[PDB]
Every structure is written in C-alpha cells, then in structure tokens.
C-alpha cells in the first residue's frame, strides 16, 4: 500500500512533465499565431495606404497628360494655321510674278 | 492513507486531462495557423500584383508626358519663330 504511493509519485512526475511540454508547445504556437495576426493586420494597413498613394499619383499624372494633350492640340492647330498663312503669301507672290 | 492516495489519484487525473486539453488546443492552433498563414500569403500576393500593375501604369503615363512635353517644347519654338517671320516681314512692308 506504500508501494502504491511510489508508483503514483513516479507516475505524477512523468505526467506533470508531459503536461508541461504540451503546455509549452501550445504557448509557442499562440505566440506564432499572434505574430502572424499582427503582421496580417499590418499587411492590410499598408495595402490601403499604398492604394490611396498610388491613386493620387495616378490622378495627378492623368492631369498632366490631359493638359499637355490640350496644349499640344491647340499649338499644333496654331502652327499649321500660321504655316498656311505663309503658304498663302508664297502662292500670291508667285502668281503676281 | 486513502487520504493521500485519494488526492494523488485526482492529481494525476488532472495532469492527464490538462495535457489532453493542451494537445487539443495544439491541433486547433495549427489548423488556424495554416489558415492565417494563407490569408497572409494572399494579402502579400495581392500587394505585389497591385504594386506591379500600378508602377507600370505610372511608366506609361510618364512616357506620355515626356513625349508630349518634348513635342510641345519643339513646336512651341517653331510657332514662336514663324510668328516672328511674319512680324518681321510686316515691318519691312511698313518701311516700303
């Protein structure tokens, strides 16, 4: 009956250490799970930040293009006109002579 | 000492149950690790694709601006030259 106790004490030791491994491993896993979560939250944040940053640069570049295109159109239409003016002169001068 | 035994039995029973529960949590955490782990990868992939597809749109637009700019600097010149050739003519004609 005291040989019962030494088996049980030996057994408790074993079990109390096993539980600790099992407990330690779980804690290691939780820390991983959380560092994974706090970096997924971080990923989602920098995604939104990026998107708005990109969409601003885009809009401002699309503005430049539109204006530059307006300018170019006007100027090209001017050059052509004021070159035609010069053509008309040539024509007239040659006709006259 | 069915007083000490009583307790020691219940103590083992506890450690046994508490190790299994931990074991159970471990499974769940691994499952929910892989799951998390995948959403992280998804996010990270979506980021890369967006970044690439945005820095390319950037390129095309800057190229446009550069080209258009060169062109307009050119026939900003031309236009301002020819307009002088007219003016100059005109004053010669005024002289005559």
Author numbering:
A (entry chain B): 2 to 98
B (entry chain A): 2 to 97
What wording appears in the published article?
In early mitosis, Spindly promotes recruitment of DD to kinetochores, the structures that connect chromosomes to spindle microtubules.
We then determined the crystal structure of human Spindly1–100 (only residues 2–97 were clearly resolved in the electron density), a fragment containing both the CC1 box and the HBS1. Thus, both SpindlyFL and an N-terminal segment of Spindly are stable dimers. The ≈23 nm CC1a coiled-coil, partly captured in our crystal structure, is predicted to encompass the majority of the long axis of the Spindly dimer (≈28 nm), in good agreement with values derived from 2D class averages of negatively stained Spindly samples and small-angle x-ray scattering experiments for both SpindlyFL and Spindly1–440.
